[PDB]
Amino acid sequence: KENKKLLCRKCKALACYTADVRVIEECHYTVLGDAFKECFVSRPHPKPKQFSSFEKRAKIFCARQNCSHDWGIHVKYKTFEIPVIKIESFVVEDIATGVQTLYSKWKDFHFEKIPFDPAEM
Ligand SMILES: [Hg+2]
């Protein structure tokens, strides 16, 4: 459908746009661009996990002050250090109406799901 906004469920700060989102292995959602990396911080994880297609290095949080809401993790996919987010950490907002939507799973969120391309970086 139309490009949409993802806002931090807790503070509502603008996180990214659906246009920036990319899909890895059909079920992992990452976000391209430098603007997005101005919104989250990374905190190393002492006892990560061993995901099937990537290495988990840390959890990421809303860079905002007094928020620090869990957004997902930061991983090494192939040769990239990228963020992978959980839709439940966001509110999806329609730009032209302001209608806000809360999802728990990416499967139920129907936007243009574009496969991750190493080309784009
Ligand atoms: Hg936030």
Q: How far is the CA of 71 from the centre of ligand 1 (A)?
A: 9
Q: Which residue is associated with the tokens 């469920």?
A: 9
Q: Which two tokens stand for residue 108?
A: 């139920």
Quick one: which of 109, 107, 108, 49 has its CA closest to 74? 49
Quick one: which of 120, 39, 30 has its CA closest to 75? 30
> Which letter, b or e, does each residue of 44-83 get, where b requires 16 or more Cβ atoms within 10 Å of its Cβ?
eeeeeeeeeebebebbbbbbbeeebbebbbbbebeeeebb
Q: Which two tokens stand for residue 42?
A: 């990374």
**DSSP assignment, residue 37?**
G
Domain CATH number, residue 5 = 2.170.150.30
End-to-end CA distance of the chain: 24
**DSSP assignment, residue 116?**
P
Task: Answer whether 64's CB lies under 8 Å from 8's CB.
Answer: yes
| Per-chain residues with Cβ under 5 A from ion ligand 1 | 8, 10-11, 13, 62, 64, 67, 69
Q: Which two tokens stand for residue 117?
A: 């391309």
**DSSP assignment, residue 118?**
G
How was this entry determined? Answer: X-ray
- Provide the CB-side half-sphere exposure for 45 (13 A, CA): 16
Q: Work out how many domains the chain is built from and give that number.
A: 1
